[PDB]
Amino acid sequence: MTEYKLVVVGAGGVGKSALTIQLIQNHFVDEYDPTIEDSYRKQVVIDGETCLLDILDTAGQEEYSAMRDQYMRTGEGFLCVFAINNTKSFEDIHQYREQIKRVKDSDDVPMVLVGNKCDLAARTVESRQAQDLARSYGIPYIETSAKTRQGVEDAFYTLVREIRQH
Numbered sequence: 001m002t003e004y005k006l007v008v009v010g011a012g013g014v015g016k017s018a019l020t021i022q023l024i025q026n027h028f029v030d031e032y033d034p035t036i037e038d039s040y041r042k043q044v045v046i047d048g049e050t051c052l053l054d055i056l057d058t059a060g061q062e063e064y065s066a067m068r069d070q071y072m073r074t075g076e077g078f079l080c081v082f083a084i085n086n087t088k089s090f091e092d093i094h095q096y097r098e099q100i101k102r103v104k105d106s107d108d109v110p111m112v113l114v115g116n117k118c119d120l121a122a123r124t125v126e127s128r129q130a131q132d133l134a135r136s137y138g139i140p141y142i143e144t145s146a147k148t149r150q151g152v153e154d155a156f157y158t159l160v161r162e163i164r165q166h
């Protein structure tokens with residue numbers, strides 16, 4: 001049974017955990033909880049293949065860290081998450097994608113750019129801006145809401161599909 005090793009990265013507070021817990025357990029964590037387990041497992045059927053997701057939910061990262069690079073370098077694909085109402089988090093994406101490229105030693109890494117919190121009205125990152133950023137990386141852009149479930153499955157399943165192309 002194939003296992004897909006996914007890693008969730010991005011700035012603090014963008015909804016990495018909320019996305020992963022919505023995916024795995026169908027619950028929205030509406031309260032920012034600072035001790036949430038990093039590892040998740042789920043058996044799912046994706047395009048007719050019964051498979052295991054092994055998801056590593058990481059933290060935001062402000063400063064370079066060799067142990068953080070090591071913790072995430074065995075991912076097969078990466079969800080690079082920002083929030084649509086957090087310009088900073090969007091601008092921070094390129095540090096995360098550089099870290100991915102450094103750890104995989106490649107510019108051809110399975111990856112999905114996720115614009116989370118799409119339910120919220122205070123949008124400061126336009127869809128076009130993110131589409132463009134994603135296009136510059138050669139990856140898809142998908143908007144999600146961990147609160148409403150919009151795009152959540154899509155983002156994770158898209159990442160599996162990208163891993164399958166690699």
Ligand SMILES: Nc1nc2c(ncn2[C@@H]2O[C@H](COP(=O)(O)OP(=O)(O)NP(=O)(O)O)[C@@H](O)[C@H]2O)c(=O)[nH]1
Nearest residue numbers: 012013014015016017018030059060117145146147
């Ligand atoms: N409205 C809304 N709020 C959300 C969404 N996703 C996350 N949140 C909220 O944003 C806050 C942070 O979410 P959380 O998942 O803890 O962020 P994180 O990226 O895992 N933070 P960290 O890197 O510090 O571990 C929580 O209050 C959460 O409820 C969303 O799609 N919509």
Ligand SMILES: [Ca+2]
Nearest residue numbers: 087124125126
């Ligand atoms: Ca603007």
Ligand SMILES: [Mg+2]
Nearest residue numbers: 016017036059
């Ligand atoms: Mg978290």
Ligand code: NA
Nearest residue numbers: 107108137138
């Ligand atoms: Na790339």
